[PDB]
Amino acid sequence: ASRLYTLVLVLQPQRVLLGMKKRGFGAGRWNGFGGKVQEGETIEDGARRELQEESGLTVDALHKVGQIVFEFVGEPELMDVHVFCTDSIQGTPVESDEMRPCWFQLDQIPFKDMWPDDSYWFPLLLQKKKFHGYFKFQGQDTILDYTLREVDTV
Ligand SMILES: Nc1ncnc2c1[nH]c(=O)n2[C@@H]1O[C@H](COP(=O)(O)OP(=O)(O)OP(=O)(O)O)[C@@H](O)[C@H]1O
Secondary structure (H helix, E strand, O other): OEEEEEEEEEEOOOEEEEEEEOOOOOOOOEEOEEEEOOOOOOHHHHHHHHHHHHHOOEEOOOEEEEEEEEEEOOOOOEEEEEEEEEOOEEOOOOOOOOEEEEEEEOOOOOHHHOOOOHHHHHHHHHOOOEEEEEEEEEOOOEEEEEEEEEEOOO
């Protein structure tokens, strides 16, 4: 019972781009760019499309960095999130009614205003490591249990 999602982090040597979600589930947090994979599109195609829709950026080269499964107690569907990274983009980030982009220096990542699971795997992403993770949440603020392991192949 899992649904496919993508998450894209535009990570450059000195900075990372995040977007403040304006509405819906998880509004008020800085997150990567992503969403549900559509019928007839590959996971990577879905990741490229979501980055454009949510940030206005065009990505050519994408790299798989992680796979994270999110469980929300009381919600039947698991989120099967395929995480990707790019340092190679075109365009300028665009603010829309749904999302506000902002660049962050790597030592100023706003963890207090991000999903709690980011504090576990973002440090791996910054050190160019690949990972498989699982987080079980109660509501939007509490991690009940989790697992996280580094892998060589995502
Ligand atoms: N680290 C994280 N942990 C948990 N949830 C996260 C997360 N990062 C992140 O973006 N999310 C949530 O993941 C969800 C992604 O789904 P979404 O943005 O609503 O997209 P959709 O599948 O509806 O398609 P879209 O509207 O085209 O983007 C949102 O509810 C975000 O709050």
